[PDB]
What we know:
The structure is cut from a larger assembly and holds chains A, B, C, D and E.
Chain A: H1 2-11, H2 26-45, H3 52-70, H4 82-112, H5 118-146, H6 152-168, H7 184-200, H8 207-221, H9 223-236, E1 243-245, E2 248-249, E3 254-255, E4 258-259, H10 262-281, H11 297-310, E5 322-328, H12 339-349, H13 352-361, E6 365-368, E7 371-374, H14 386-402, H15 404-410, H16 426-430, E8 434-440, E9 443-450, H17 452-465
Parallel strand pairs in A: 1-6
Antiparallel strand pairs in A: 1-4, 2-3, 5-9, 6-7, 8-9
Helix pairs in contact in A: 2-3, 2-4, 3-4, 4-5, 6-12, 7-8, 7-10, 12-13
Chain B: H1 18-40
Chain C: H1 3-6, H2 10-22, H3 43-62, H4 71-94
Helix pairs in contact in C: 3-4
The complex binds magnesium ion (2 copies) and zinc ion.
Zinc ion binds at residues 50, 52-53, 55, 87, 89-90, 92 of chain D.
Chain A binds five RNA strands through residues 22-24, 27-28, 30-32, 35, 53, 55-57, 59-60, 63, 67, 70-71, 114-119, 122-127, 129-130, 201-207, 210, 248, 369-370.
PDB class: rna binding protein/rna
Keywords: RNA splicing, Spliceosome, Catalytic Step I, Intron lariat, RNA BINDING PROTEIN-RNA complex
Entry title: Cryo-EM structure of the Catalytic Step I spliceosome (C complex) at 3.4 angstrom resolution
Amino acid sequence: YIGNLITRQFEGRSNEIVKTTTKQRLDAYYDLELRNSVMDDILEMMPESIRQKKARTILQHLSEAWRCWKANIPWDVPGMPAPIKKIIERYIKSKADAWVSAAHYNRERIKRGAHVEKTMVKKNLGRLTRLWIKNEQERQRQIQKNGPEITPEEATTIFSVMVEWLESRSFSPIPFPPLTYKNDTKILVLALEDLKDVYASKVRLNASEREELALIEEAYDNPHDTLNRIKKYLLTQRVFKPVDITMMENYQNISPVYSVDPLEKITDAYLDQYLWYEADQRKLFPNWIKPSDSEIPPLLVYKWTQGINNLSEIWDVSRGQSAVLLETTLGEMAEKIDFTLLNRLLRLIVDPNIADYITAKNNVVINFKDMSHVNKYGLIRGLKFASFIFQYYGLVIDLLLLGQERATDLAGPANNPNEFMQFKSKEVEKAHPIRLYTRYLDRIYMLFHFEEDEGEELTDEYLAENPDPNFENSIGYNNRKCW
Amino acid sequence: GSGDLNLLKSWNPKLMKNRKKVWETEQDLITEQQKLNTRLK
Amino acid sequence: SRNVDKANSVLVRFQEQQAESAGGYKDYSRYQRPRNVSKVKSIKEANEWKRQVSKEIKQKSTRIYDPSLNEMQIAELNDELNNLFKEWKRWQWHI
Amino acid sequence: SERKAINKYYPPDYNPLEAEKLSRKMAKKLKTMNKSHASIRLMTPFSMRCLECNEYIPKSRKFNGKKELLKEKYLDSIKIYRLTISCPRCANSIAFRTDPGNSDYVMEVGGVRNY
Amino acid sequence: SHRPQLEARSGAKAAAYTPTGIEHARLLPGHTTLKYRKSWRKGTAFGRGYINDMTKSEYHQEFLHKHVR
RNA sequence: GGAGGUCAACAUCAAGAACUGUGGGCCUUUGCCUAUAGAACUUAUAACGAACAUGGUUCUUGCCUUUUACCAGAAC
RNA sequence: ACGAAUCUCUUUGCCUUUUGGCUUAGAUCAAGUGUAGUAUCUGUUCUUUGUAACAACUAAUGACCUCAGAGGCUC
RNA sequence: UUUUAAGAACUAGAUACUAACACAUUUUU
RNA sequence: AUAAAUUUUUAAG
RNA sequence: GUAUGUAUUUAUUUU
Lengths: 483, 41, 95, 115, 69
Ligand SMILES: [Mg+2]
Ligand SMILES: [Mg+2]
Ligand SMILES: [Zn+2]
């Protein structure tokens, strides 16, 4: 040290001072090597003369093509010699691949949570939201070109199922709110409160939020008026404002957050509240769809265990008897929903006005910074009433799983619906292999009580279409590692 | 560093330490002028 | 805090108050006029107070001819000149 | 020489109160300490319009500017300050006042406010 | 006034300066010796590979299909 | 000529369980085989030091806004 | 009659003072605060023997002389 | 020419400068 | 019939 | 993380 301090004190510090690449200045160098590497090529393709003007110009075209690649915009230049476009496409493809790979690498470095800088979390978040929206727009376009996947036949089968159910229940399509409604004021008060409670605890209110609170106050002062405006929107307006997405990070998952505009938020809230009130009032949802009101989730689990035990014979080892539980995530669900179908299946349950409304509300331009695309296919889970839609559709799936009969057994007769766990006779229990079925949002939990006959039949057909000589079905088989 | 530097300085009246000072002095003077009005009656 | 604070602190001043008594420091880049002339002291001192005027005569004298266009401004600055030059006269007269 | 510094070497004698007296005498003769004026970096809350070059200080702009303790005292006792700001385009000084009774500023001499 | 660069510094310049003689950390002698070579079912409703690209590959859609939840 | 020196210079001190010289035979000097002489200092619960520090690079961690300074293991 | 040269104008060509970077669009568009660091001043009072008489003493300029600026004399 | 500041003594007590740094603020009545 | 013991501070931004 | 910048000529260079 002191050697350097003193020799530097007489002789002055070295004039060269080259400086190595490290974590902070890396990206700068990468840019620099790239723009140089494109300078060489696009100078060597051109036949002779021009340099500096066309230098600056062509490198600008580089930058623009990159930005437009982040934004998913295809970047066509109205004219430009094709070979140059070959080159720039090449290099920006390169940079793209390196960039993505850095996004993966940093992410799986954060999931372990070892020494990631304060910013790299933010930056990586940004790259992931960009990439995620790119996957989305890809999926939607390829759905246009490839057409919808439902096919007319399967759709007809589905709709038939739902109709058969809604007659089996003798269900009344929910009436659209009357201009005079006895409970209407009571519901409105809650919906405004539920919007208010977001802002009760906030400190600093941005402009949009202040505008909202203005709409809430003016909404209290004129409940009759704001009803008039709300229902008027339910009728007239089929076209809506764009919606912003800001992905919030859980440090492992990155989850989306939809943000809608206040006027639309009010009608969405009122319509939501209405649908849930009338729906639970007419007992649309059977017992076994339960992320429901009366029970907090641990109480749900407890009742699910007590439900398991209390019903008969399951612990009998007497001869061959066995039992099975399925825990199955439905997988992508809101992302595969289609509107041509939604409009109809909502026509069954609800007046065509609200159904058409909801159907249209999901097609809206989605905007994140540069990236923007119409949402042509899947569900937007951020709408206030996306709850009701989501559950209803879930029911539509469950009727497929259980079949009409057994479902009527669980939900029991429309005269006297059962409770969460009940039946009429233990016969009705034993009359079917499925004993307990409940669906908590995505998750599906199923209970089967088998005997040697039926079980050996099932494995006879399964093995009959799946020969497994090496007995290796149990390799890819997964089970709990916590115990 | 984003918002207004004015909030971080003392002289500006809009921030809550000085606004409170004005509240207190004005309140005291309201008491005094009130009592002195009642005396003259 | 701007060094205006840091140069006026006690720990800065006290060494100046020692340098006056122990030697020939104390500047004259600090103090102002002093307002009255005849109240000044031995010649070797007013000598430095006088240059402490002529320097400003040079600065603002250069600041006269500048095109920078503010005529009211150069009017008041012109009067300031005359004032100072009169002071220069006074310091010479005392000498 | 650390930015956060606990001690400062003092001369071996240094009667501190004596230095307070002699320094208190010294405080009158200096040019800077007595300037009656002040310099502060600040912002423009209410925006502006210049009355010379009609330049616009758009909303809130940093300035190196000048604070002055005003001879007024709001009510019986409250301090009230007057700030000055030079225009970027032209050499012009615009002033403020801070009304403690009405929280917002009121201004004079060389600028007008946008509505 | 930020600019791309439109050039590099030719080491020829640094070749004509005089050496300072500061001693660095990594130039202390190390590795100093070379090395030389020598009935229930009947009621149901329904009866009964390398792409070159980063975004459209399969691993990628696995990735974003997971970490976005 | 003997005893010494808080004197110096030049050699040598980590390896086929290992050093050097020499005689003789074969290949064609090297190298292999055979014969002979001398081997200070350091080594088997392994080493010149019956002791015990720091630095560089590369990985793994630990603190955890970032860099020096760091946390404790490994290889070179 | 065409060859040759100057001046003026129009069209084509060249294009002349003709967007010079990267990162999470670099971030944000606020009746709002926290937190960290550095430094000491304003008022009042006080201060800035006479007459008469007698005796003695009180720098600049010019001219002249002497010596190698100094000395003396006069106005 | 013009002009008045400087010294001595006494009193009670808190105020300026900087913002580069962090700003889901959440939440139990 | 148990004897099982981590840390610890300065500068710059 | 308490910027930064500009100027601070006194002693008289041969016509
Ligand atoms: Mg940095
Ligand atoms: Mg900095
Ligand atoms: Zn102006």
